[PDB]
Amino acid sequence: SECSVIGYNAICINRGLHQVPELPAHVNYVDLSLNSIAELNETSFSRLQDLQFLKVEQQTPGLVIRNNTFRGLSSLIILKLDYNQFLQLETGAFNGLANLEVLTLTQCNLDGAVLSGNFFKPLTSLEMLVLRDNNIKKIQPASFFLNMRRFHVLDLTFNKVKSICEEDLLNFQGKHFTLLRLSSITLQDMNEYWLGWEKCGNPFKNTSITTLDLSGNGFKESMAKRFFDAIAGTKIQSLILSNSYNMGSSFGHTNFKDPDNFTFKGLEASGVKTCDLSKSKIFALLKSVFSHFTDLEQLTLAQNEINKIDDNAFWGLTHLLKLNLSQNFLGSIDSRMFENLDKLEVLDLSYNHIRALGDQSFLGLPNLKELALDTNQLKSVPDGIFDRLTSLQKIWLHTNPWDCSCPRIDYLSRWLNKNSQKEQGSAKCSGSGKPVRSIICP
Amino acid sequence: GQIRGLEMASKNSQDGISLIQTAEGALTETHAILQRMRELTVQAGNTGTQQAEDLGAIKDEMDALIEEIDGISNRTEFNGKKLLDGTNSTDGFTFQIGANAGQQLNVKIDSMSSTALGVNALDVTDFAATAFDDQLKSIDTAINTVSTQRAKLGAVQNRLEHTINNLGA
Ligand SMILES: *[C@@H]1O[C@H](CO)[C@@H](O[C@@H]2O[C@H](CO)[C@@H](O)[C@H](O)[C@H]2NC(C)=O)[C@H](O)[C@H]1NC(C)=O
Ligand SMILES: *[C@@H]1O[C@H](CO)[C@@H](O)[C@H](O)[C@H]1NC(C)=O
Ligand SMILES: *[C@@H]1O[C@H](CO)[C@@H](O)[C@H](O)[C@H]1NC(C)=O
Ligand SMILES: *[C@@H]1O[C@H](CO)[C@@H](O)[C@H](O)[C@H]1NC(C)=O
């Protein structure tokens, strides 16, 4: 035999094959990736009726899949045809695949007709469709999607999609997606003066989404506001807007606006439980900016350019448990910054430039379990700063230039010694390099 | 002894993957900077005649963004080797992934500096000398270039994933 056959698995990778090889009838897993198969047809898999898992990824460019190629593979659950450059599908290529659950077609130069034509009509049990990195410019699923009742995962990452509107996504109405990944599709036409805004309606009408990934799409504030107004009411549990590269003003520039209280108003009825706005050049957290996220439990703003947090920035976040502000440009913390966060359990302030903590910085945070202040520029803290943090389980204070002069260091050294089971890593004195916990002031 | 050879080809394949991932990460940063530049350029083009004072603030930001592109181009490294400054781009990176000598994989990555991408000369205060459409086109060509380089690396990564599965079998 040409391939390596172990039990139920035929591994046929990179064997210089020009056709499907001869294999034991009992194999149910076949990997034919990295071969030179130019054409597949109904004879190709006619001796392998028991296949459950089939890969034919990244052949020489131009693979042709004829009608009924997989007809009679009525046990096939997973089919992967990724990285077939200039893949040529006949419209009945997937005939017979009523039980297929996963189809992957990443980077196959496919266009929007692959969703609007009859290619996927036979796939009545389909659960997951991966179409990343193709040439899909509009997302317009054909009417048969209405009856694909287990369909719940779609990934269109890296397609250059001009715009999405209610009329495009019609045939996804009524679905519950567990994952809708529309990352880095750009949506270039949907700008400030586009007439499509008046008629766009709600792209996600009567659709619910557990995880909506809209990362890497720009989302200039004015665009975000329009987009979230358009989808108002859509139930979304987890919203990913990381790498929204137009959203923030940026540190030292005012060409663009940071989000404000009106930006996310459309999300008020969405029930969002987690939100990721990391890596989006945000400079200022403005008054009530997050107050429409009435159900929010986790929020990351990591890796922005945040240097300014307005009073009442977190107003209305009465359910928030976790707040990540790691890797920003904060120069200090004061007690007003973190008002309106009574339920907070996890506060990450690591990798900032913080050089001072205001006297009662954490007074409004009695439920805090985890507090990261590592990798900042703290030389000292005010006496008693951590005393009311009665639920604290972990604290990071390392990689800070602690001034271990006495009596300045008295409180912190005594506190870190008394609470040595909470400290993660080891806070060290500038100069001497000894652990802060070991300093005894007389 | 044949087992050692498979173990070696596999480790070298994983390392190719980590290298490619580092480059993909940096390229997605470049891409994001370029799209922000595009958006700033669009906003500049839509700036009224009475609002011409805004153009200098836009140029200031784009100039800093062009600097960031160059910072990425110059610092991005794996295993002590620069990935995106073009300095390795004629030889490329070669991985020994075959269970015998000859079976080999070479990856070329072009320079992604602002000069190599042709976005160095952008100037939103000077649509009178270098047309808005030409400046926008420069930015779109640079976006296409970065995106094509990323796609190319995705194909090679996929090849390396399959080679690892192959060696394991
Ligand atoms: C806050 O977000 C940061 C940035 O995303 C998270 O940083 C990651 O941290 C993990 C574990 O420490 C590392 O393995 C990753 O490499 C980090 N990613 C980056 C991009 O730096 C951090 O974990 C988050 N904090 C909390 C408490 O979730
Ligand atoms: C598939 O192609 C071969 C030629 O390679 C042809 O003879 C065969 O009839 C085709 N199969 C079917 C089911 O038509
Ligand atoms: C493939 O199948 C479609 C629909 O099932 C059919 O209309 C067509 O005749 C077939 N195409 C070719 C080129 O034979
Ligand atoms: C949404 O879809 C469900 C499932 O088809 C349907 O029964 C319901 O009537 C729809 N609701 C609206 C408001 O269109």
Numbering used by the authors:
A (entry chain A): 23 to 464
B (entry chain C): 54 to 222
Task: Please quote the paper that reports this structure.
Flagellin is a structural protein that assembles into the lash-like filament of a bacterial flagellum, which extends from the cell surface and allows bacteria to be motile. Upon bacterial invasion, flagellin is detected by Toll-like receptor 5 (TLR5) and NAIP5/NLRC4 in the host and activates innate immunity, contributing to the immediate clearance of pathogens from the host. TLR5 is an innate immune receptor located on the cell surface, and consists of an extracellular leucine-rich repeat (LRR) domain, a transmembrane domain, and an intracellular domain7. TLR5 recognizes flagellin as a pathogen-associated molecular pattern using the extracellular domain and activates the MyD88-dependent signaling pathway and NF-κB-mediated production of proinflammatory cytokines.
To reveal the structural mechanism of TLR5 binding to Gram-positive bacterial flagellin that lacks the hypervariable domains, the crystal structure of rTLR5N14 in complex with the central region of bsflagellin (bsflagellincent; D1 residues 54–230) was determined at 2.1 Å resolution. Consistent with the biophysical assays performed in solution, bsflagellincent formed a 1:1 complex with rTLR5N14 in the crystal structure. bsflagellincent forms a 1:1 complex with rTLR5N14 using a primary binding interface created between three long α-helices (αD1a, αD1b, and αD1c) of the bsflagellin D1 domain and the concave and lateral sides of TLR5. Although bsflagellin lacks the hypervariable domains, the bsflagellincent-rTLR5N14 complex adopts a similar 1:1 architecture as the sdflagellinD1-D2-rTLR5N14 complex. A comparative structural analysis of the bsflagellincent-rTLR5N14 and sdflagellinD1-D2-rTLR5N14 complexes suggests that the LRR9 loop of TLR5 centered in interface-B plays a critical role in both bsflagellin and sdflagellin binding. The side chain of bsflagellin R89 is enclosed by the side chains of TLR5 Y267, N268, S272, F278, and K303, that form the cavity wall, through van der Waals interactions and is stably hydrogen-bonded to the main-chain oxygen atoms of TLR5 cavity residues (Y267, G270, and S271). Thus, the R89A mutation in bsflagellin ablates the shape and chemical complementarity between bsflagellin R89 and the TLR5 LRR9 loop.
